[PDB]
Design a protein around this ligand. Sequence first.
Ligand SMILES: *[C@@H]1O[C@H](CO)[C@@H](O[C@@H]2O[C@H](CO)[C@@H](O)[C@H](O)[C@H]2NC(C)=O)[C@H](O)[C@H]1NC(C)=O
Ligand SMILES: *[C@@H]1O[C@H](CO)[C@@H](O[C@@H]2O[C@H](CO)[C@@H](O)[C@H](O)[C@H]2NC(C)=O)[C@H](O)[C@H]1NC(C)=O
Ligand SMILES: *[C@@H]1O[C@H](CO)[C@@H](O[C@@H]2O[C@H](CO)[C@@H](O)[C@H](O)[C@H]2NC(C)=O)[C@H](O)[C@H]1NC(C)=O
Ligand SMILES: *[C@@H]1O[C@H](CO)[C@@H](O[C@@H]2O[C@H](CO)[C@@H](O)[C@H](O)[C@H]2NC(C)=O)[C@H](O)[C@H]1NC(C)=O
Ligand SMILES: *[C@@H]1O[C@H](CO)[C@@H](O)[C@H](O)[C@H]1NC(C)=O
Ligand SMILES: *[C@@H]1O[C@H](CO)[C@@H](O)[C@H](O)[C@H]1NC(C)=O
Ligand SMILES: *[C@@H]1O[C@H](CO)[C@@H](O)[C@H](O)[C@H]1NC(C)=O
Ligand SMILES: *[C@@H]1O[C@H](CO)[C@@H](O)[C@H](O)[C@H]1NC(C)=O
Ligand SMILES: *[C@@H]1O[C@H](CO)[C@@H](O)[C@H](O)[C@H]1NC(C)=O
Ligand SMILES: *[C@@H]1O[C@H](CO)[C@@H](O)[C@H](O)[C@H]1NC(C)=O
Ligand SMILES: *[C@@H]1O[C@H](CO)[C@@H](O)[C@H](O)[C@H]1NC(C)=O
Ligand SMILES: *[C@@H]1O[C@H](CO)[C@@H](O)[C@H](O)[C@H]1NC(C)=O
Lengths: 389, 317, 122, 49
Amino acid sequence: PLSETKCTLKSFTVEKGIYQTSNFRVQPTESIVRFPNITNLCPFGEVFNATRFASVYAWNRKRISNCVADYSVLYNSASFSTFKCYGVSPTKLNDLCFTNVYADSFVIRGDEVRQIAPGQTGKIADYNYKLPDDFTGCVIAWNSNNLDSKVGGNYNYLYRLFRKSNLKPFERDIYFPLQSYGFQPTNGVGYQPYRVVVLSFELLHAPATVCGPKKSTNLVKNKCVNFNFNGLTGTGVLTESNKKFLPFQQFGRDIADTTDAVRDPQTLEILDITPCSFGGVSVITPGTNTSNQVAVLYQGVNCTEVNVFQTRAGCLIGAEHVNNSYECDIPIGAGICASYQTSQSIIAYTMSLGAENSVAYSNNSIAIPTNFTISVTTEILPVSMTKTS
Amino acid sequence: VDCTMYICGDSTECSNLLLQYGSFCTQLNRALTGIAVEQDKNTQEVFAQVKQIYKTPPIKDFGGFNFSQILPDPSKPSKRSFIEDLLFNKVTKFNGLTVLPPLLTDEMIAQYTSALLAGTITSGWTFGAGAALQIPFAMQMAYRFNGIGVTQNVLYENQKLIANQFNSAIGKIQDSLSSTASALGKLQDVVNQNAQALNTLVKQLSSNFGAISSVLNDILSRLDKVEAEVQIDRLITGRLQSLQTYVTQQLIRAAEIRASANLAATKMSECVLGQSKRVDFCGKGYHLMSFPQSAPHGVVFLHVTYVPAQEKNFTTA
Amino acid sequence: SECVLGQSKRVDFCGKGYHLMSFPQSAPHGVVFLHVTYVPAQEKNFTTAPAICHDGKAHFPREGVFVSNGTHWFVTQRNFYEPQIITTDNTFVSGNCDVVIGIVNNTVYDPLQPELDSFKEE
Amino acid sequence: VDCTMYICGDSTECSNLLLQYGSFCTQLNRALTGIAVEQDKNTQEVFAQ
Ligand SMILES: *[C@@H]1O[C@H](CO)[C@@H](O[C@@H]2O[C@H](CO)[C@@H](O)[C@H](O)[C@H]2NC(C)=O)[C@H](O)[C@H]1NC(C)=O
Ligand SMILES: *[C@@H]1O[C@H](CO)[C@@H](O[C@@H]2O[C@H](CO)[C@@H](O)[C@H](O)[C@H]2NC(C)=O)[C@H](O)[C@H]1NC(C)=O
Ligand SMILES: *[C@@H]1O[C@H](CO)[C@@H](O[C@@H]2O[C@H](CO)[C@@H](O)[C@H](O)[C@H]2NC(C)=O)[C@H](O)[C@H]1NC(C)=O
Ligand SMILES: *[C@@H]1O[C@H](CO)[C@@H](O[C@@H]2O[C@H](CO)[C@@H](O)[C@H](O)[C@H]2NC(C)=O)[C@H](O)[C@H]1NC(C)=O
Ligand SMILES: *[C@@H]1O[C@H](CO)[C@@H](O)[C@H](O)[C@H]1NC(C)=O
Ligand SMILES: *[C@@H]1O[C@H](CO)[C@@H](O)[C@H](O)[C@H]1NC(C)=O
Ligand SMILES: *[C@@H]1O[C@H](CO)[C@@H](O)[C@H](O)[C@H]1NC(C)=O
Ligand SMILES: *[C@@H]1O[C@H](CO)[C@@H](O)[C@H](O)[C@H]1NC(C)=O
Ligand SMILES: *[C@@H]1O[C@H](CO)[C@@H](O)[C@H](O)[C@H]1NC(C)=O
Ligand SMILES: *[C@@H]1O[C@H](CO)[C@@H](O)[C@H](O)[C@H]1NC(C)=O
Ligand SMILES: *[C@@H]1O[C@H](CO)[C@@H](O)[C@H](O)[C@H]1NC(C)=O
Ligand SMILES: *[C@@H]1O[C@H](CO)[C@@H](O)[C@H](O)[C@H]1NC(C)=O
C-alpha cells in the first residue's frame, strides 16, 4: 500500500495523513454463457442459393425467427464480393441474440451498389428500396455471371427508373416508370448483375429467438461471474428473486440504466443481479520519517469479502482497536481516529472530546479569580494568492 | 465518486480510452476529497468551541427556569433531548458513489452541544474566556440584564414572572416543532439539493451522447475495435462532462455552506459563550443568551431576548 | 479594523479570552494577527448572595456581587477578587426586602454616620 | 435562458438531437431559476428588516 501511495503522490515521502490511492473491485471467477436454444437452423442457404430471384421493383422480404442461426459458416465461406455491416461488426453477429431477422432479397447492377448504402441518396435508394439512416444489419453482395447473367440478355429482372414519390424505409411499391436491364457476361463488370441481400435485425427489446451455435453453461448463484443473457454480457453476482415478475418481460432496469433483474433465457426462474462488491481504497499512515508501517481502509465494504477491525467507514486492516480514548491524530470516519504510538503499531480508537468534567453548582456559590494571566494567541489568515495569467 | 466507475462499468477498453485523456478525472476526485475534508472542518469549527466536556448537575433548581426540554435524558441509548428528537425526525450505487460518513456522529454532536449548554447554564460566559467559573443562574440572568441597560433589581423582583414566561416560550417552541416541519427548510433544501444532483448525474447514464446505445456493454458485445472506440468516445465526452458539471455545482454549494458554517460558528461563539451587543444578530430583541441544539447536517440556535412591551406616553425634558 | 484599531467586545472573535488589543504582522500572501487576551485563573470558591436587607430596604450592587468568605461579607468586582467594605456608594436601593428571594441579612457601613457621630461626640 | 431556444432556433431536427443529450439543459434552467429566486431573497432580507 505504501508504494501505491508513493506512486499516487509522485513523491518518495508520505506525510502523516490519510490518502486515497486506488479502488478495489471483486473480479469475476468464471464465465457463464446462456442463450435460448432452438432445434431448427435458420434457412439462409435457401435464399442465397435460390435459383430464381426477386427483381428490385418487387423485392422479396423473407422473415426469419424460431431458429438457431449459424452465420459463421456463411461468413467463413468465400463466395461474396463484399460483406459490410452497419452499426454492427460482421464477426460479432454470432455473439448477439435477436428477436427477428428479415432477409431482403433482390438483384442489382454493379455501379448501383455504390448507392445501396443506408442514408445514401440516389435513384435505386429513393425510388425502389430504402434503408433508414438508423439502419442496423448486414448487406451482402456477390457478383453474378452465370446465375443472373446469361448470353442473349436477361430481362427477368426489372428496375424502376422514375417515381413520383419516395419510400418510407422498408416499403415496396406496386413514360412507364419500370424498365429492364440486359445482363450478358460479355459486358464489363459494372454492367454485370449482382445478387444482393440485406439482413436487417431488430435488436433485443423482447424475447430473442435467433442466435449463433453456442452452448449454454449452467448458472450459479452467490458467486461473482461474467454472465451473458441473450447477448447482454456483464459482471455481477446472481441470486434468486424476491420480486414478482410479469409473464412477457425479461429485464428489470435501474435508474442507472443497467440490468438489475433478468429471467433465464431457457428457464422460468427470475434472478436478481447485484454487482459484486467494490469500494474505494485509502491508506492510513503516519509520516515516513518515523516509520514505514501502514494500515488500509477498504471503504464501504466489510471484512467478509477482502488484525482486522470493522467500522462503519468500512473494513480497516493494519490497525488494532483500543478501548482507551486518545484525542484525534488521524481522522477516518464514524468517530474513529488513528495514530502511531508505542513495540509500535497503528492503533484505532474512538476519539475523545476532551476530558469528562463538571462544574460545581448551587444557588449560593460563586467563583471569582484571584490572579490572571496574559496569553498571546496567533491567528493566521490568507489575504491573496499568486496573480496568474 | 470514482470517475472510472461512473464512465466505464468495468471495461478495460473504456478505461484505456479514458487513460488517454490523461489526468482529468484525478482532478474531480481531488476536488470531492477537498469538499469531504472541508465538511468535517466546518462541523469541527462550529461545535468544538469548548475546551472540556461539562455534564449538567443533577440539581434542577435554577430560580424556576426549566431546562429539561433541552438537556439530555440519561435514559436514552443515544443521549438527546426532546427538542433534539423533534429535530432529528423532521428531516427526511455501483457507479462510483461512495457516501463517506461524517467523522462526528450525531451522538458526538449531542455531547458537544450538551457540554456547551451546561457550561452556559452553570458558568455564564466565563468558560468562553478562561477556566469555567461557577455561578447561579439567577445572578447570571441579572448579569445579562445589566448588559442591556436594565438594572438587576428588575430581575430579582420579577424573577418568577420571567421564569414562567421563559418556560412558556420553550413550550411554544416545542409545540411549533411538534406539529410543523416547514421550519426546517434551511437544512431540508440542502438535503434535497444534494439528493437531486445525484439523481440527475445518474440519469445521465441513460443518454446516448451520439452513440448507438446509452449502455456501454451492448457496444462492447457488438463491435470490433476501430468503431467501438468511436462510439465509446462519444459516450466519454459527455459522461465526463456530466461529472464535471456535478463537481462544479457541489463546489459552489460547498462554498455557500462554508459561509453559513462560519456564520454559525460566529453565532455560537458570540451568543452562547457570551452576550451580543450587536443588535438583531442573535434573535430579535435585546439579546441575553442563547442555547444550541443539534440538527442533522446543521445546528439550531435558540435565542432568548428581552422585548419591551406595554408602555405609556410621558412628557419629558 | 475591529481588533487593531480598537477593542472587540465580540467574545472570542479576536483571540480566546477577553480581548485587549492586537498586533498585525506581515506574511507572504497573508497576514498574521497576534491577539493579546486577559485570561482569568487561580480562583477561589465563595458563598454569595443576590442582595442584602439592611433595615427592610433591599440593597443591590452598582457593580460587582456580594460575597462571603466566612464570618464577613464584602462586595467586589467580577473578574478579579479585590474585596471592598460595602457602602451606600457601592450599592443602591429599590423596594423592600420581602419581594427579593435568596436574600440575606447584613449591616451596610455608611460613610456619613461616622463624621456626624464625631460631631455629636463634640 | 431557454436552452432549446438558444441552441436551436425553432428546428425540430436540432431539438430532437438535443433531446438525445438527455437532461443537461434542464439543469441550466434550474440553476438560473435558483439564482432568480435568490436575488429576490437578498433584497427581501436587506430591506424587509
Ligand atoms: C421542567 O419542565 C418539565 C415539562 O415537561 C417538567 O416535566 C413534567 O413534570 C410533570 C410533573 O412535574 C410531569 O407530570 C410531566 O409528565 C413532565 N413532563 C415531561 C415531558 O417530562 C418538569 O417537572 C419541570 N421541572 C421542574 C423542576 O418542575
Ligand atoms: C406583564 O405581562 C405579563 C404577561 O406577559 C403579565 O403576567 C401575567 O399576569 C397575569 C395576572 O393577571 C397572570 O394570570 C399570568 O399568568 C401572567 N403571565 C405569565 C406567563 O405568568 C404581567 O401581569 C404583566 N405585568 C403587569 C404589570 O401588568
Ligand atoms: C474573611 O476576610 C476577612 C477580612 O480579611 C477576615 O477577617 C480578618 O481576619 C484577619 C485574620 O486572618 C484578622 O487579623 C482581621 O482583624 C480580620 N478582619 C476583620 C475586619 O474581621 C476573615 O477572617 C476572613 N474569613 C476567613 C474564614 O478566612
Ligand atoms: C433579617 O432580619 C429580620 C429582622 O431583623 C428577620 O425578620 C424576622 O424573621 C423571623 C422569622 O420570620 C421572625 O420571627 C421575626 O419576627 C422577624 N422580625 C421582624 C422584625 O420582622 C429576617 O428573618 C432576617 N432575614 C433572614 C433571611 O434571616
Ligand atoms: C433447450 O434446453 C431447454 C431446457 O431448459 C429446453 O426448453 C429446450 O426445449 C431445449 N432445446 C433443444 C433441446 O434444442
Ligand atoms: C448454398 O449455400 C449453402 C450455405 O448457405 C452452401 O452449403 C452451398 O455450398 C451453397 N451452394 C453453392 C452452389 O455454393
Ligand atoms: C527526519 O529525517 C532525517 C532522515 O531520516 C533525520 O535525520 C531526522 O532526524 C528525521 N526527523 C526526526 C524527527 O527523526
Ligand atoms: C457484511 O455485512 C454486514 C454489514 O455491516 C456485516 O454485519 C456482516 O458481518 C457482513 N456479512 C456477513 C454475511 O457476515
Ligand atoms: C475493552 O473493552 C472491553 C469490554 O468488552 C474489555 O474487554 C477490555 O478490557 C477493554 N480494554 C481495556 C484496556 O480495558
Ligand atoms: C400615547 O401613547 C400611545 C402609544 O401608542 C399613542 O397612541 C398616543 O398617541 C400617545 N400620546 C399622544 C399625545 O400621542
Ligand atoms: C471550590 O472551588 C473549586 C474550583 O475547582 C471546586 O473544586 C470546589 O468544588 C469548590 N467548592 C465546592 C463546595 O464545591
Ligand atoms: C437554594 O435552594 C435551596 C433549596 O434546596 C435552599 O436550601 C437554599 O437556602 C437556597 N439558597 C438561596 C440563596 O436561596
